[PDB]
Structures are given as structure tokens and as C-alpha cells.
Amino acid sequence: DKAVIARLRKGGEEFEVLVDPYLARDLKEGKEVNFEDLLAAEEVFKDAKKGERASVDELRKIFGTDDVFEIARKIILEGEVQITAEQRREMLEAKRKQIINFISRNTIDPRTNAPHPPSRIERALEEAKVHIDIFKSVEAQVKDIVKALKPILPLKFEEMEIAIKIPPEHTGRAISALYNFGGVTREEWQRDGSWICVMRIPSGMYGDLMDLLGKVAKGEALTKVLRRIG
Template identity: 30%
Template sequence: MGIFQPSGQIKLTNVSIVRLRKGGKRFEIACYKNKVQEYRSGTEKNLDEVLQISNVFMNVSKGQVASSEDLKKCFKTENVEECVAEILKKGEMQVGDKERSANQEAGVQNLVHLLSESCIDPRTSRPYPPSMLEKAIKASGFSLHPTRPVKAQMSAAISALATKGGLDIKRARMRVRIVADGKDAKKIRPKMAEMQGAEKEDEEVGEEWEWVGLIEPGLLKDLNEMIRLDTKGSGTVEVLDLKEGGAGEESFA
């Protein structure tokens, strides 16, 4: 990649600046909007398609190019392409106020959708209307972190809604059916009775043992593994409803 030496202030349009602080200094690169995420996801591999200017800057808007000495000191290399790749991978994308506001609003709508899909009012076992969730999010003062996935912030959001948003809210449990050989029930039944977050609705014991009840979604992986080990692969876990009051069906051998 060639070195570009600007003679004055650079005028860029449709630009996204990716910034990385390293070795006590700030480094920036000028990228095309939407291309940064494509590069990070692997769908775009050509740096020329990502960068507006093929260089590393101390300050893009002022046209201050990073010196070879600074690159070598902080990145342990003078190779611009290697430095650019690291900034793209680890740097933070800078956005304007309007774009930041739009991203925040989109994040809130995504959060509302996730809460509506996975949480309920424990008094009615029904989901809250999206409009009520959105109002409660604003009332709680909960703010999404701009660089973290919305799904990873759900627990914090639920806590904020319960303590500051005025909502009695909890994650919905899923309804499952476990089927195993009757002889394996002696090992599995005590474990199900002790499993925190599991509630039995129905049970039949005979040559074939069947347990139907509610479990916390986070228990599904451990439950599948337990049934697989205790039945040597012959037992099954079937999801009857993805959430209380919902519908869905999925089987796990």
C-alpha cells in the first residue's frame, strides 16, 4: 500500500473514522461507512475497498499522518497495512451525533423486541406490550452500551426495569418434555427435583419415563448434557413451548 502525504486539511465525505489508542498515542484510519463491519465479519477482505485513504493518521480531520517512528514504536512494525489491519480489528468506530442517536434508537427497539419475546409479567405469564416496555426503559434511565451486543445487555436491562422502571418482569421459562428408559429414571428424577429453576407439571413412570415441566432457558444446555450422559444417548429432551404462553417445538436427542 502506498504512503499518502497530504499537503493540507483533508476533505472527506461519507467517512467513518476508526480510532485506536496504543502505546500512549492515538491512531486513526478513514474508512467507508458500512465497510468496517463487513471487514470484521470477513465478508470484505480487500483493504482498498474499506479505506478512503490508505494510511494511518494521528488525526484524520487535520491530515496528520502517523510517522514511521510512531508506528514502529507502538505497533512494532512500519508496515502500514499491518497497522491498518490491527486498527480495523481492535479500534473503536467514531460516529456523529445524528448517527449515534439513530443507532441508540435502533438498539432500544431491538431490546424491546428481545424483551417482548423472552420475558413475561409473572402475575399473568404473558409478555408486556412493546409500547409499555419502551416506556419503562425510558423511565428506568437504562442506556445501552454502544459497542456491546444488545442481547448481552438484557440481564442489566431486566434488572433496571424491575428496580427503576416499575415493571414486575422476569425471563419466561420454556416448557420441555424429557423421555427416557424407565430404568434411567432413578438417576434422573432426583436431579430434576433438585434443579433450581425447574418445575414439574406432569410425570409418568413405567417402562418409559416421561417428565413434563418448565425450566429456565439457561438450563437447556446442561439438561441436554445430563440426559445424554445418564441415558447413554437414548433419552431425549423436547421443547414444547419456547416460552410460557408461547408455542414452538424442537427435539434434542
Template identity: 30%
Template sequence: MSRSLVQPVGQKRLTNVAVVRLKKHGNRFEIACYKNKVLSWRSGVEKDLDEVLQSHTVYSNVVKGVLAKSKDLKTAFGMDDQTKICLEILEKGELQVAGKERESQLSNQFRDIATIVMQKTINPETQRPYTISMIERLMHEIHFAVDPHSNSKKQALDVIKELQKHFPIKRSPMRLRLTLPQEKFNSLEEKLTEWKIIIVSKDESGSQLSIVCEMDPGLFRDCDTLVRNLQGRSEILAISVHGEGDIHADHYDGHDDVSSSEPKKLTEPVAQLTENMQKQTLAPKTENTESQVKQSKCSTCDAVVGDAKQYREHFKSDWHKHNLKRKTRQLPPLSAEECSADVEISDSKGDLNEYSF
């Protein structure tokens, strides 16, 4: 029975490496790097080139171990210095990643974009932000695809513009403090009315007038330029204001209402999703919800000790420790007052014993 003859391979095969590839003058040049070191080098964290490159060698194919020809290097780079060429490829080349790593990066960036969209938008009806899961579902509905070479914030702004075409969503207003001379206020007030900016409060201090207002973020640059021309200054108090948290937004008269004709343009699944979103949005807080705090009960002390924080602190108290000792002796628990009296009696007995000796 014939067997195939196995010849030795005269190539140095590199595996489990990070490959940086650069195409120049019709040729492909690659370098072999250590994983997770390329980004550190580009961000300036890693300074030692030997910690980044596995070898100061330029390849035409790292996986197969094929070295780049000296003639091609001189044609593309004008030199054959391997180290300098490696530096240029490291700076300008494209990092090649495996399929699973690429999926993980895209998934993380998709999540980052959804988070930015959530932070910058609100529901115009409730003045509250949507949840992160809702934003991700809407992004899937509009078939959004992540661009790994583009900034996450820029993509988030594009997503917001696309979502506004189909769903009840708007940019959350930003809160500013505008300070300018009082005699210049009339010129500013006309523009604020034209831009439909909400004035929250006014404060006069000598010849200066301070205004706290809320506006669409897209108007910030124009407003800041106008205030500077009026010899004033602007200060950002909050980038995103909504009806949740410490800063409460008022009802806005100038927000863009969603026309009744738009839902007719949506397909049935999208319209149903929008209806589900409205059901899942957070309802405004009432006075009763704040007072209704979940109470916790300690079985050892047989008493209600308050909310979760007070419940944890209760376990460190002398009252709980004293009842725990009584429980091991199969004695009934004592109240807080009875526990204090029992401890005082025990201390008094201890003092008398010490005095008798």
C-alpha cells in the same frame, strides 16, 4: 480597503469517510476507510483490504490530513510498515461515527433490547406478555441508558432484574421435556418440588419416563446437570411460554407475587403508569371472541362473502367477474347459483353456434 491574503493549504483533507482511531503509547493514530465497510471487514464479509481503506496511510488526524510521524509509528508499533499498521488499527481501533448515526444506532439497539425483554417476560397476573410500547415506557421510567459496547441480550437481562424491583413483571417460563429411567424419578421429583417446577404431563415408555414441565429459565442449567447425572437427557420445547399463541401456560402456583407494600414505595407517576399498564394488558380470550369474525360485503354482487381472506379470494372468482360484466351493462347482480346457471346457458349457446357452423 485591505483584503486578507489566502494562502494554499498544504494538506490533503479527507471528508465523508469513516475514521478508525487507536490510541497507543500516548499518541493517536487514525486511518480513513469507506463508510459501511469497516463492520463488513470485521465480520468477515469483506476480504479485499483496498475496498475498506481509502489509502494505506496512517494519520494522526484524518479530518485535517495530518500524517503520523514515522518516529511515533516505530515507538508504538515497532515498525513503520503502513499497511500492517493499518491492519492492526482496523482490527483493534474504535470506529468513529457521526452524531446522527450514533443516535440511530442507540435507538435501534434500545428497540432490540425492549423486544428481547418483551419476549422473555410476562405479567404474573394475566400470564401474558406486555406490549413493546409498554416495555419501552418502563425502560424510560427506570432511566435505562444503552451501552453500545455491550451485548443487547445481556443488557436485556439486566433490565428485567431492574424492572422486577418496581413493576409486576417476571421471566416467562420455559418448557422442557425430561427423559430418564423410571427408577431415578424419585430423586428428580424432590428437586422439581423444591424448585417449584410445574409438571405438565408424564409419559411412560418401557423403562423410560418422559416428563414435560415448565420452569424458570434461571434453573435450566441446574436442572440439565441433574438430569444428566441421573443418566437422562433434557430437550427444550419452548424458550418462552405464555398465555398467547399455540402454547398455553397453566396458572402457576410458584410465581413470585408482588407484595402490597411495594406500590407504596413507588412515586405517584410510576404508580399511575403501573395502573395504566394493568388496564392495557391483554384480557384472556373467550369463546365468543373467536366466533365473532368481521364479515365483508361485496357491493358488486350484493352479498356477504366472509372474512378478509375470503373477501380477497371472492374478487378472483367467476361469480364476481360475471357480475362485474353485468354491472358495466347496468344489469342487476346475480346470486352464485343464478350466476352458474347463466354461465351454463351461455356455454350451451356457444356450443350450438359452433355446431351450426
């Protein structure tokens, strides 16, 4: 009873599969999913609660194939995943969090070129009554959300390129930490033991980069803002 029914009406018939609701959510978002884990039974049902299985001949007729994996994919994508009220709440809470974190990191308020705390984006989501879609990725719904937020919270998606030089003593620590932060481009070791790159980062993550650099090169790293990319 961990599995939930996903259901699709096709050609005057009902078809059901029994799936892990989180992995089904992942598939509808466009993530890669392990079908052996997704499916609780490798079967298409006419009625899963009664154990009435769909015949191979009916599947070929309606779906054009008898492959349970391909048919499960269609049912999940085109049909309805019957998650519980408590799964839905939990998924909604997790998705809203990811949206909030992504907006906070990938935008700046043009009233300092700085980023709103998560808490301010959260209140703004409440106040504009933004619909959160649990079966879409952040990336696929965030444009629409930011547009619903424009009236009461102004936000621009901005990136920056920032030239970095790390002196020879501090490379062992700094380089590896910068790759871990992400955004390293045009990296070049220098004959004197130093190393340079251009970091391409979400403008909301500037202050976080600058703190990382303080830590890992003890305030000896040199930087230069090359451009902001609106």
C-alpha cells in the same frame, strides 16, 4: 465523506483510521466484519483530515506491527469512533428497538406466565431511564437492563419444552415451518407417517408457536408442556 474517524492516543501520539461507522459499530459489538468494507483507506493516519499518514517505522514502534487491519481493530476497540449526532440517534433508536423486541420475546410476566407488549417494555425503559449502549450487543447489556427494570416491571427469563406430534397429512407443511421458527430438538419420524419433537422455546413465544401450529396442521397437532426452565 461517508467515512468517520476512529481515533486512539497511544505512546504520546494520535492515530486515526477512516471507517464505515456502521461496520465499526458492528466490530465493537463483537460481530465478524469484512475489513475491506470497514476501512475507507487502508492506511493509519496521524491526522486523517490533513492526509498525514503514519510511517511503517512508527507503527512497528507503537503497535508492535505494521498490519493496518490489526491496528485499525485496536483503534476501533480501544479508541473513540467519531460518529455524527444523527448516526448516534439512529443507532440508538435501532438498538433500543432490538432490546425491546428481545425482552418481549424472551421474557414473561409471572402474572399470566405471558409476555408484555413491546409498548409496555418501551414505557418502562423511559420511566426507569435505562442507559442504552449502541456499541454493545443486546445479549451483552440485557441482564443489566432487566435488573434496572425489576422495580417497576417484573420479568423473568423463562424457556419451555413442549412435546409436539404432527399427524401424517400435515408434516409436509409443519416440519419445515417449525425448523424456521427454531427450537426443534429430539425429532423422530414415526412408522405411521407422523412426526414428533420437543420444541425448546422462549416462554414469551408460546402463543406464537401455538398459532403457527393451528395454521400449519389445521388444529390437529398435539402438544404437551413438559417443563418450564427458569
